[PDB]
Amino acid sequence: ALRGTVTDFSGFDGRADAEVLRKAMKGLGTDEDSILNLLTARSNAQRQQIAEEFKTLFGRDLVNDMKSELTGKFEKLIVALMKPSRLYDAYELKHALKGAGTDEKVLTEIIASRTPEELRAIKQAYEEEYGSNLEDDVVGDTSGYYQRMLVVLLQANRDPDTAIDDAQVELDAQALFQAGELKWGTDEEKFITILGTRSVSHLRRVFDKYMTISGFQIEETIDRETSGNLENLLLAVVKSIRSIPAYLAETLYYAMKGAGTDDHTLIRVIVSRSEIDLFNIRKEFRKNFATSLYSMIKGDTSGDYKKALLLLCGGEDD
Ligand SMILES: NCCOP(=O)(O)OC[C@H](O)CO
Ligand SMILES: [Ca+2]
Ligand SMILES: [Ca+2]
Ligand SMILES: [Ca+2]
Ligand SMILES: [Ca+2]
Ligand SMILES: [Ca+2]
Ligand SMILES: [Ca+2]
Ligand SMILES: [Ca+2]
Ligand SMILES: [Ca+2]
Ligand SMILES: [Ca+2]
Ligand SMILES: [Ca+2]
Secondary structure (H helix, E strand, O other): OOOOOOOOOOOHHHHHHHHHHHHHHHHOOOOHHHHHHHHOOOOOHHHHHHHHHHHHHOOOOHHHHHHOOOOHHHHHHHHHOOHHHHHHHHHHHHHHEEEOOOHHOOOOOHHHHHHHHHHHHHHOOOHHHOOOHHHHHHHOOOOOOHHHHHHHHHHOOOOOOOOHHHHHHHHHHHHHHHHHHOOOOHHHHHHHHHHHHHOOOHHHHHHHHHHHHHHHOHHHHHHHHHHHHHHHHHHHHHHHHHHHHHHHHHHHHHHHOOOOOOOOHHHHHHHHEEEEOOHHHHHHHHHHHHOOOHHHHHHHHHHHHHHHHHHHHHHOOO
16 A cells, blocks of 8 residues: 555666766766766665676775765765665664754654664664664653653554454543543653554544544644653654654655755655655645645755655656
8 A cells, every 4th residue: 555656677787877877977077967867766776786886897986976976955865865775764863863962853753653663673773783772872862751752662562453442442542531631730651651552553543532532632632731852752653653654744744834945854754755655645745735745845946956856756746
C-alpha cells in the first residue's frame, strides 16, 4: 500500500552515469542541469554505485566534488540525496543533537514517525557511524517527560497488532480520561505508557471510544492538558498512529505555508521518504489541503533546487 516517487532506473549503467557527472563538472562552470536530472532519477542505491564508479574511474570523490561546485540550498539537497538511505535519519538526528542547543523538531519528527523496525536500524547505524549511543545523546540533550517519551519510543518496543480486545480498548480510553480531563493537573506517565507502547491497531480504537466517552478527540485533550515539547511530541505520536503519511504531509504543509520556507524540513521529508511513501504523502496532502504538493513547492522554491524538488515529487495535481 505505501509507495515512493523515486525508483530504480531501468537500464542503469554506473559507469555511463559517472562520466556524465564528471563531464557535468570538469573545468569552468557546472552544468547543474545534467546533475539534477541524473540524480533525481536514480534510486539511492544507484547513487551509491554511481559514487563507486566515479572514484574507480577518476580517483576523485563524487560528493566532495559536487560540494565544491554547487552551493546554497541546491548543494544541501543534492548532499541529502547522496546520503545512503540507512544513514540519513541517523545523520539528521546527530546534527540535531550536536552543539549546545538541540532542535526538538527533528527529534520529535523522526522518532515519532518512524516505525520500531526503523528505529532499530537508526540506532544500529548511528552507533556504528558516530560511536555514541543514540539514547544517551537524546537523554543528554533533553529533560522531563519529553525525554522520557522519546526514550520509551527509542526502545522500539511497541506491542504487536494482535486481534483486538474491546475490554482493553474501553479500559484504556477510560484511564486516559481519568489521567487528563477528570484530573486536576495531569498524569503524563499514563499518557507515555499507553501512547508509547500499545499497538497501533489498538490505539486507533482507543482514540475513537475515548471520543465517545469524553466528547473530546485525544488531540484536543493533549492540547488542554499539556504544553511545550511534550504537547508536540504527543500530537506527533497521535498523528503518526492515525497516519504517518498524513502526519508528514501535514509537516510539509507548515513548512511551506509561511513567511519563508522551512527549507531543512522540506528537504529532509522529501528525501527521507522519496522511496518509502511520498506518493501517499502526496495523496493526503491534497485530500487535506486542497493545494497539491507540486504547486506548493512551485511557488516556494526557486532555482535548480525547485526543479530538483519537483522532479523528486512527481505528479502535479497528485
Ligand atoms: N483544562 C485546564 C487544565 O489544567 P490542568 O493541567 O489539568 O491543571 C493545572 C495544573 O495543576 C496547573 O499548575
Ligand atoms: Ca567546474
Ligand atoms: Ca552554473
Ligand atoms: Ca559548495
Ligand atoms: Ca545539544
Ligand atoms: Ca531547544
Ligand atoms: Ca538530560
Ligand atoms: Ca487535567
Ligand atoms: Ca503531572
Ligand atoms: Ca497546550
Ligand atoms: Ca512559503
